[PDB]
Amino acid sequence: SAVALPRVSGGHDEHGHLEEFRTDPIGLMQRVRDELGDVGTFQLAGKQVVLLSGSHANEFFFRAGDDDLDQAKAYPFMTPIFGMLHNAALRGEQMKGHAATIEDQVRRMIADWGEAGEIDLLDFFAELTIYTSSACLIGKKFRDQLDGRFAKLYHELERGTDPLAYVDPYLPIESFRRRDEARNGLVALVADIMNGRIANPSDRDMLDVLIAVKAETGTPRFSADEITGMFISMMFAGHHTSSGTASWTLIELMRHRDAYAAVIDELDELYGDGRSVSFHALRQIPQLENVLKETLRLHPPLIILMRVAKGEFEVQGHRIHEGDLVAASPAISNRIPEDFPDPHDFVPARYEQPRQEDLLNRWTWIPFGAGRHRCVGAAFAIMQIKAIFSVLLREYEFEMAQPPESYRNDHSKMVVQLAQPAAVRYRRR
Numbered sequence: 001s002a003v004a005l006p007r008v009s010g011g012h013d014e015h016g017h018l019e020e021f022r023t024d025p026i027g028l029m030q031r032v033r034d035e036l037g038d039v040g041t042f043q044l045a046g047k048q049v050v051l052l053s054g055s056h057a058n059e060f061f062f063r064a065g066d067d068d069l070d071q072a073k074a075y076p077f078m079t080p081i082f083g084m085l086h087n088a089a090l091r092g093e094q095m096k097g098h099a100a101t102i103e104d105q106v107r108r109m110i111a112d113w114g115e116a117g118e119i120d121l122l123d124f125f126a127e128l129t130i131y132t133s134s135a136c137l138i139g140k141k142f143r144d145q146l147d148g149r150f151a152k153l154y155h156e157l158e159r160g161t162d163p164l165a166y167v168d169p170y171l172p173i174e175s176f177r178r179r180d181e182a183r184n185g186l187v188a189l190v191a192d193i194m195n196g197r198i199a200n201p202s203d204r205d206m207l208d209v210l211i212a213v214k215a216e217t218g219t220p221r222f223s224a225d226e227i228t229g230m231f232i233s234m235m236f237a238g239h240h241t242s243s244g245t246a247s248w249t250l251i252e253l254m255r256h257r258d259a260y261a262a263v264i265d266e267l268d269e270l271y272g273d274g275r276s277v278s279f280h281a282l283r284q285i286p287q288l289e290n291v292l293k294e295t296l297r298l299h300p301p302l303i304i305l306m307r308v309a310k311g312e313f314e315v316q317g318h319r320i321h322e323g324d325l326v327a328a329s330p331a332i333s334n335r336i337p338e339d340f341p342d343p344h345d346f347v348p349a350r351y352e353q354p355r356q357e358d359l360l361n362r363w364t365w366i367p368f369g370a371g372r373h374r375c376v377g378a379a380f381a382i383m384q385i386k387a388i389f390s391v392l393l394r395e396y397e398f399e400m401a402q403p404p405e406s407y408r409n410d411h412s413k414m415v416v417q418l419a420q421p422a423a424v425r426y427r428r429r
């Protein structure tokens, strides 16, 4: 019985649909839903990906236990990179402080901005998010010993996630080589901070905690190599997502001056009570929030969510087998026509009380995913954007220095990022 799941057209290239997935993954995924519907597959090298879409299919996907759809082995490119977080830095009691930390990191970042100038959205926000994450999730003391170097290396790590990892995480290609060398540079970086603390024993941070943990032998339990990895781990899920979202929030505001105007008036109005960013970032900021939600629907940082099937299951009559990669796609589900009218349109109103399309499509509006394993950093990420823009939009006004269309994502790697250049002009309000 040579029966198989329905497969999307194409896949002609050497590694099937891989070549396409590295160029236009969203187009490939839309063609799957368009030709096959809710359940369809495409081939990534040797592996088959079972792409689920639509409310019913996604519900099955998100309500499944880690015993059915495991995430652990779904992203082999993470092994070389790495080599819970919630308890350490995401406790609600900590949000207020993180709001202040973030505000401080932003003001520090733009400190040399002056009157007017230009920045690159990817460069600015990517580095800014390294500082906010490192400062909040690990500690300011640690962040203060970091600079553009750490950021540049961390970026090489993210550019080391070419879909070819599904063939082998250690292929002798350039991106995988750069990835390994970059991590080697991150260890040298962390080791230097570690030796400074040991040679010269106060506010304590997560690095202090990891350095102090002793093995039963009495010897320290973690090496510089292991600490760097854990640190890379703590910041990975929150870095490229925040950087990208921040970039696309400013891009959309700039593309739609009407939304920009509204956000600005509301911020000046909100802050008119004299309270701080750490006070307002934890509280409602409607216009800004709806622009954010609309930015996440149109440009979700994770365009595909992966899993490895453990058992034998059936989704809408189609049979999934153990070993199959099962996948959900926020890029695709977030634009399903019947759930989000004019899906390709930037319509913040979509989330105002009268519609709240985000809450009426619990299994389709999945920029943060859904179910039990819905992004645990969601509240932090929202607070961060509020905190970041409360500072930027009040101090500076922005404008595009390139055609509106040239602002787009780079889909060559599993981790999505803004293509360059992404130049933007700024000027003090």
Ligand code: HEM
Pocket (backbone or CB within 6 Å): 071, 085, 090, 237, 238, 239, 241, 242, 245, 296, 300, 301, 302, 305, 306, 366, 367, 368, 369, 372, 373, 374, 375, 376, 377, 378, 380, 381, 382
């Ligand atoms: C607005 C920016 C962000 C977006 C769109 C986002 C989105 C997501 C999505 C879609 C998932 C689920 C992935 C899957 O189902 O395979 C996820 C998981 C996760 N995110 Fe985020 N995230 C963002 C920011 C952050 C930040 C800033 C942090 C760190 C404070 C973070 C930490 C995590 C963690 C730890 C998980 C794993 C959750 C679990 O499996 O239980 N995220 N995120």
